[PDB]
Design a protein around this ligand. Sequence first.
Ligand code: CNC
Ligand SMILES: [Ca+2]
Ligand SMILES: [Ca+2]
Lengths: 400, 76
Amino acid sequence: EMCEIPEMDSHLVEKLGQHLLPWMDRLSLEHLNPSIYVGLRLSSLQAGTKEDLYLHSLKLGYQQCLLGCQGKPSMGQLALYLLALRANCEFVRGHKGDRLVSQLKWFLEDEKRAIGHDHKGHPHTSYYQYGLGILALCLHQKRVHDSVVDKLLYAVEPFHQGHHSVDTAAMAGLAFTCLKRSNFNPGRRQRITMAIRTVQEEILKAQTPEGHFGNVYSTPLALQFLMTSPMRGAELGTACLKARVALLASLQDGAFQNALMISQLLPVLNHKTYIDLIFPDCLAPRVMLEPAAETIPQTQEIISVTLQVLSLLPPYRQSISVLAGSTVEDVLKKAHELGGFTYETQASLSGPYLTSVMGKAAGEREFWQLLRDPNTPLLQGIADYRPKDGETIELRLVSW
Amino acid sequence: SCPPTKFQCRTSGLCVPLTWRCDRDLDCSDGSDRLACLAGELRCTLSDDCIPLTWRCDGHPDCPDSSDELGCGTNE
Ligand code: CNC
Ligand SMILES: [Ca+2]
Ligand SMILES: [Ca+2]
């Protein structure tokens, strides 16, 4: 059947938008987020004249730093900037536009070379950004060579190496879908068609008993992909409705507070996906967002959190006291304030990313993994996860 | 209502740099605005730029002078 998510409560949706609203005023290149802009335009919600200023900031930052800063955007972020142009019914154009396109095309070419004629090699980034970059170029009707598409095809086709997340598979499917709708790689038409089906079954098989596809935060992008095509022979309808039940429970439980996650979910709640950026409808009516007038309550409770790092000699294990409601990053900050602990973060569209712990920076295909007790990886980053009293947070350097 | 080392625009008033002015494209509003190539690569005609062979005749001008998208199209 077909993947359909029946509309939800307008108040739940507006609540999501209000989380997104403060970011509309944060125009610092460190804070600028093309994904927020895309997600807001594809939604039923609107920020009014704030949007135009946000877009202008994106145009300033991205075109001056990539063609000229502090930390110019990555190529993956450039791809999302391209999606933002489409969200405003623009095609990338002119000499700056044309050169930005070629930069992204260089990104894919380098990543293709890294993967190799062999297909063992990893991308310097991820297959997620690989798929995202193909999608971005396709949405602006820019063609990539068959050999570039082949890498994404081989990554999901039968007897592929590695294992990919639902998120990564969904982004691949979105790329494939854009190629198919645009008739862009006729020499790979039949393989592209088969890849889309493959991604669909991989995603449905990844559906948990609670209803989510992988986890709660993979469900939005997965639903985006599933919504773009019908699935005959399969029971897509029931799968998507069970995903809705899971999604709804997570919303009412406050699972979606991170801005980029909201920006990936809002299109779904408006029956739209990134594929709607092929033929965008920029003038479709959207409800204006006003600031939530909500009085934030101040806690009076102290909680203690055990912070531990066993990846380093000598190991670190300390009980850190913070106000109830604090984030992991607050715990980290307080550990640093007590002495004996240090760390580093870098900016990303999902917020602060943990790069270094106590002098040790994650190397190639390594990262600092966040875990809680017992041996359970967090589903949120240091700025979003809020530990309970008595919980133990581990920072573990892992290879993937 | 704008700065000295930036431009101003007349319909949005959103100020714009002026290494953007005015560079044959509409950044504003209104309008008041040798090192041998690697194997498998290809050199541009009016410059030193190198591009993968697969970017020749792919519908987008990757060379500053669009050398790669001239002689399109062939047959075979
Ligand atoms: C690949 C990827 C994936 N990951 Co990771 C996973 N698993 N991630 C990152 C990878 C980065 C390295 C790499 N080679 O790219 C990788 C494999 C190490 C990974 C690790 C993180 N991930 C994890 C999560 C939970 C986040 N990640 C996602 C962005 C999940 C993503 C899926 C998704 N839906 O986005 C994902 C598929 C694609 C992200 C991307 O490239 N976006 C496009 C890119 C152009 O935007 P960007 O902002 O510039 O990308 C950077 C950031 O995304 C940063 N980053 C990656 N993950 C996070 C998570 C947070 C919370 C923050 C603040 C930044 C990041 O790394 C990217 C640069 O390489 C998120 C959806 C994944 C998910 N389904 O759970 C999720 C985030 C959930 C949320 N509520 O925000 C970890 C927290 C796991 C853990 N318990 O340790 C961990 C972050 C630890 C830390 N040091 O802060
Ligand atoms: Ca100009
Ligand atoms: Ca070309």
